[PDB]
Write a protein that binds this ligand. Structure first.
Ligand SMILES: *[C@@H]1O[C@H](CO)[C@@H](O)[C@H](O)[C@H]1NC(C)=O
Ligand SMILES: *[C@@H]1O[C@H](CO)[C@@H](O)[C@H](O)[C@H]1NC(C)=O
Ligand SMILES: *[C@@H]1O[C@H](CO)[C@@H](O)[C@H](O)[C@H]1NC(C)=O
Ligand SMILES: *[C@@H]1O[C@H](CO)[C@@H](O)[C@H](O)[C@H]1NC(C)=O
Ligand SMILES: [Ca+2]
Ligand SMILES: [Ca+2]
Ligand SMILES: [Ca+2]
Ligand SMILES: [Ca+2]
Ligand SMILES: [Ca+2]
Ligand SMILES: [Ca+2]
Ligand SMILES: [Ca+2]
Ligand SMILES: [Ca+2]
Ligand SMILES: [Ca+2]
Ligand SMILES: [Ca+2]
Ligand SMILES: [Ca+2]
Ligand SMILES: [Ca+2]
Ligand SMILES: [Ca+2]
Ligand SMILES: [Ca+2]
Ligand SMILES: [Ca+2]
Ligand SMILES: [Ca+2]
Lengths: 271, 271, 276, 276
């Protein structure tokens, strides 16, 4: 990172939309019920040809399927340069979907949390505990300077306070500056101490149906809808995919290249 | 592609090896027999830890396994920024080793061929026909200027001249300027008309045991033996992997980034 | 010398060349020929060494300067090879199945080494630099290594269970183990059957020339995968009979020793310098 | 850096004296004690080596720097001794019946020897100068010699008949033969149980000291009758208990090392002269 000096009289360059469409890849994540309703084995080819009409080279649009929001929330691996997640809306899962967005619309720096030997705390409002697995049931016992527990006994987990049960993904936020003993099913869950660095610009979430319920910020005073959080009413999935294809330029305009240099181990679908 | 003007007094920068390892990744391709002899369920983990001692961050080194040279030759996909292929030497598979090395050490620009409709010819010395699949059998019938076979009958394919039998990968080089009718088992193998653009500088091949027998150029008058074609003597595979880990600095020094802009969206690892 | 080793030597680029010292070199030097037992078997003669001495005399050597050290095979000769003469010419026989052993022997005798004892039963060992290796030789040498970590715990192997260690050498007369540098390794070796030393490669030998009889260029005297230097002291010939090989060696001894340099023979005959 | 050349070194007669290097020498060097088995039996303590190491530590030697090597007796030790430490001290018990054997042992280890092979079958051998000797080692060395004349016929001997050869060694573990220089000799040696080498005495071996435990001064490391030099590395002590001997060795180790110098042939400056 170096200072960048620019002249306000500089001329705008031509549109780079065609070049980025040519040199980038698009990943679409949709629920399995979409494929079920569409009921066509060649719909991937059809959408690829339509995207080609929109400018994307054949083979650069990758279609990925997930069973549901809860299943997809277990270590979501976003591959392409541009990722669009068609997330079905369920009034009962408002938190979970929000968490999923909170997981994929932001960059997270995470380190392992070996709870069974160590005591942990959250240093600042950017710190959270992200737990992912088949079943994440997390109980918390706040502690104090004398190392005793408040309304909890370290020797009896039954007295721990319940913050998660049977979760595929959950973001736990506790009071900062306080040590907590943790009890999570390590067999079916992995908990990580994470810091949200900032927005993840290459991931857009399109909520299919419902209303604006997403809250990607733990602060109760903010519920910001960024340009990467779209929301479309629906009755047929074919119309949903047609509107995704037709307004692909608008969707990618709302997104930007990831720009982060990572330390992780994930594959990517790039050109 | 613009001219670059440089001064012969510009100060050398510091070593980029540390940041290169922290920002790049290493795919190591080994045969199945290597894992069989190692006889450990966690040799990947210890090799990754040793690589970390050598500088690479955890999860950056990828370990891919192939049954043998023939099977690996069937459309090999190279994922990491730096690819090292440990190829065992067999005195009876020199041409197959050479063809694999040619395919993965050079950059190729390929287009499909329709052998059942049109006749084909090779324009210049860089033009070849690469056929790969489960079983490639290619027979050729050179035609004269009256589109009539020479020493072959266009109607009868039994008179055709056999250039490949049951191969999994074969690079066919015929006389340039002559139209050839091709009889290829398209049901089990695909043939593509390709041009050699240049070297793939991100792929190194380490020949385990044997002699210098590789020939990555069809010209009889050249056997280059470039700096990306190493050879070692061995008795045990653990020694081979320890040598690869210890001298990974030299291996990566012998390689450079791919530098080619691709029109194809494939699966890669990139940190 | 020592007190003037770090002193410059200045030469003028017009100093007249001295005459040939080849004749005076042969009259004050000793030549050692190392050949396999099968060479003597195929020759099938008892006075052949005397005839070779007389032929070398025809080539300018005094009687008493050429010596012939027979060795059974490469593997046995690889156990503490001893270099006796001013000039050593080792006739190695090529076998496709013993490429690594040939390379290890050439590495041992074509280079200077500085070795120290390794009491592998008490301490763990590292390899500090790319010039550091572990050279082990004996009747039979099986080496098992367990890399440790910063906490001194084995990686991929239990520090207490040798069965989990990693095999890098099985029943070796000679083996040069190269491990990842900077990592502590617990070792277990058949100490009864072989000795293992921590060795450092100082540089070439310059008085040992290895002639490979038959085969292709397969020797690799450097552990670095991206280098296979073919120095002027590692020669290769094609053969159908051993008398022709010996006649070639005698007739081109001028060329063979022009490719070697005197002053490199150590007081000891060992292929390595040793410090305890 | 300039290894093959002897460059003069100039020094001013008034520069300074650097500080004592004894402490650093003891910290970065290794000491080896060679003693007879009967010493160990008389001491009759299992942990005595540990006690001696502790006592040396009191004198500034880091633990593990001092080594103790056992040898059965003078004759057995004389068979190809291998002194590998930086500093070597050999406690040699005096036997009035083994005066020449002790002299030969000391001459072998207190001097520097450059040895070439000898093939008694092929060649007849001369000794060129006063520094040329024939050193033979083995389980049993029996050397008989027939001096020839200018016509290659024996003098007081027949080359074909070894029974007439003049015996100069019988069942020796080590023997240094000195014969008349400039005379070709035919040698009969028990090659099965003995190897003979044509050796040149280059000079003193600085880093080897011999402490004679017992009788008067009898060692003669010089083949010349007119001189029997007693160098500062040839110590002599009167004894009644081996514990007393070892305590004397430990207490005066400063003086013992002061009487010795780093082996000139074993440090980098010796590179491309003979060894390292
Ligand atoms: C930009 O668009 C204009 C308008 O057609 C065209 O003339 C020009 O070549 C394009 N490229 C650049 C680099 O300005
Ligand atoms: C480069 O290395 C030098 C010396 O190793 C050091 O002073 C300097 O800070 C390093 N970084 C840069 C950017 O020059
Ligand atoms: C060197 O060779 C030349 C010509 O063969 C001869 O005249 C001369 O005496 C020789 N010796 C020396 C010391 O130059
Ligand atoms: C040498 O000895 C003197 C006097 O004891 C001391 O002051 C000095 O630090 C020592 N070291 C050097 C390098 O002179
Ligand atoms: Ca949840
Ligand atoms: Ca409670
Ligand atoms: Ca908090
Ligand atoms: Ca909020
Ligand atoms: Ca093939
Ligand atoms: Ca035909
Ligand atoms: Ca062609
Ligand atoms: Ca070629
Ligand atoms: Ca070997
Ligand atoms: Ca293991
Ligand atoms: Ca190493
Ligand atoms: Ca090499
Ligand atoms: Ca007689
Ligand atoms: Ca004797
Ligand atoms: Ca004499
Ligand atoms: Ca004397």
């Amino acid at each position: 990172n170096l200072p960048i000096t620019g002249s306000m009289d500089t001329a705008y360059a031509n549109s780079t939309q065609e070049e980025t469409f040519l040199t980038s890849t698009l990943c679409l994540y949709y629920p399995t019920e979409a494929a079920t309703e569409i009921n066509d084995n060649s719909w991937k080819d059809t959408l690829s040809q339509l995207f080609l009409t929109k400018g994307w080279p054949t083979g650069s649009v990758y279609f990925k399927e997930y069973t549901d929001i809860a299943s997809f929330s277990v270590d979501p691996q976003l591959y392409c340069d541009y990722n669009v997640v068609l997330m079905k809306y369920d009034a009962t899962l408002q938190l979970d979907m929000s968490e999923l967005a909170d997981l994929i619309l932001n960059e997270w720096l995470c380190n392992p949390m070996d709870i069974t030997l160590y005591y942990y705390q959250q240093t600042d409002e950017a710190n959270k505990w992200i737990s992912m697995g088949s079943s994440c049931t997390i109980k918390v016992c706040p502690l104090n300077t004398q190392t005793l527990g408040i309304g909890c006994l370290t020797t009896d987990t039954a007295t721990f306070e319940e913050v998660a049960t049977a979760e595929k993904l959950v973001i736990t936020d506790v009071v900062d500056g306080v040590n907590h003993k943790l009890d999570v099913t390590t067999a079916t869950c992995t908990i990580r101490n994470c810091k949200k660095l900032g927005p993840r610009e290459n991931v857009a979430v399109i909520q299919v149906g419902g209303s604006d319920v997403l809250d990607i910020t733990a602060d109760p005073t903010t519920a910001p809808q960024t340009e990467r959080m779209m929301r479309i009413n629906w009755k047929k999935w074919w119309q949903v995919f047609y509107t995704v294809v037709d307004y692909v330029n608008q969707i990618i305009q709302a997104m930007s290249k990831r720009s982060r240099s990572l330390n992780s181990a994930a594959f990517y679908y790039r050109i």
